[PDB]
Paper text:
Further rounds of improvement were successful in delivering a high resolution-diffracting monoclinic crystal form with two holoenzyme molecules in the asymmetric unit that was amenable to ligand soaking studies.
Author numbering: 7 to 375, 379 to 457
Amino acid sequence: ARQVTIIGAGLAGTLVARLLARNGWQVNLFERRPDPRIETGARGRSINLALAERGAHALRLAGLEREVLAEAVMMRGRMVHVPGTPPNLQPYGRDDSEVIWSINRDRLNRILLDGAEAAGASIHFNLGLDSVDFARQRLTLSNVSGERLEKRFHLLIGADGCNSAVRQAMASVVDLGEHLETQPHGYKELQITPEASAQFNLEPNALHIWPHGDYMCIALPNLDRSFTVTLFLHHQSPAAQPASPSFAQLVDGHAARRFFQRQFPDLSPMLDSLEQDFEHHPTGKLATLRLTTWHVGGQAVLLGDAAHPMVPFHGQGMNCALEDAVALAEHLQSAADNASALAAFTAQRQPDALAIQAMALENYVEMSSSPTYLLERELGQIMAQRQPTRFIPRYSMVTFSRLPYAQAMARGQIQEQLLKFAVANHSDLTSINLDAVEHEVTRCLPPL
Ligand SMILES: Cc1cc2nc3c(=O)[nH]c(=O)nc-3n(C[C@H](O)[C@H](O)[C@H](O)COP(=O)(O)OP(=O)(O)OC[C@H]3O[C@@H](n4cnc5c(N)ncnc54)[C@H](O)[C@@H]3O)c2cc1C
Ligand SMILES: [Cl-]
């Protein structure tokens, strides 16, 4: 039986552990944090995420989709809150087949942990990877106190998140060709109680957005009708605009309250613990990191956030990591040797990871901030009705299909240019020749 060591019992790490163990691999998984299934007196984490077709299909192959969706809230559409006008639901698709699921992160992690152990994997908690000696095939782990433990390894999988210790150890034996692009936005997690959401009639089966240009708020529902709110705001005010809002200008919780009362007046009354949450929850950091190399021969490989950190403006990070886990287990199972598998996995997944990283950065302007946009959207809806197998909106290709990310991006660019050109010198749809646009659709877009 083939042997494998995995670092990180997160979302990608636990899924890949189950897929390999059920195929007869001898699997050992190491996690820095304690086992979350061991109940303590401490408060549970209220963090949630948007699960789409890519992530759901990966769970379906693993035999875990039913268990996960049993505790997921259906999001049928987007609820945009702009002051003055009441919110109106913008449905994602034709029916409840085209939806996104809101799931508690800790609940998903516990289901995955149970799944990896049921398949035969051994999980070791309270052990963080410190360093790797590739030539001697040994690694060093330690608990929070710093007490060290050495282990021999054969194949190493880096599923240890955006600040990966496996990636740091690899950078010493190979040039990874790393390119980091910092993000000016920070984030803060806040809460809406079940009592407050019900009092203010906040729709439970939708994803909520409070757009405000350079900054914004999003809210995802929980099973108990509570909501997890995320504020996206610049860490620092720029030199060009010194008076602009930023985290630096929000010295305490009282400062945060006055800011919300002024910029988000319909959201502020729903945030009862705004002051406490602002001061106790730390500000998170965002970035895009691109690597030319994801592996070291047949010895080590990276996947998920360890391989491709991305901005969270498309809700596809977890979805991508689960898709990576399926591809890695498939390559390792059927290759001539581990070196061949790691090279082929890297070649297949790298162009897709670059495509989703670029699409996530582009999606920020869509969520946070036109007469020309509405005409393009109207013509795009008609083209999708005439040719539903050729004209599929980019958001729909990413979120509701398994088309490779690079293909979704390429087809999306063809459609965006087709719509832009068609409306360019026209006041309204009555002056636009619909059959001529349809001809461009059939000429430039093959059926799927
Ligand atoms: C604000 C925000 C919102 C998001 N919303 C969404 C969303 O709606 N939909 C979506 O698809 N994605 C979303 N994402 C992205 C998503 O959270 C991540 O992409 C995903 O968790 C990555 O999975 P992973 O397994 O690669 O890493 P992780 O889930 O981060 O797991 C890494 C694991 O490794 C462990 N670890 C770290 N270092 C070590 C070490 N040295 N030794 C041992 N163990 C270690 C960690 O404790 C952790 O358990 C969001 C991200 C952010 C920041
Ligand atoms: Cl994301």
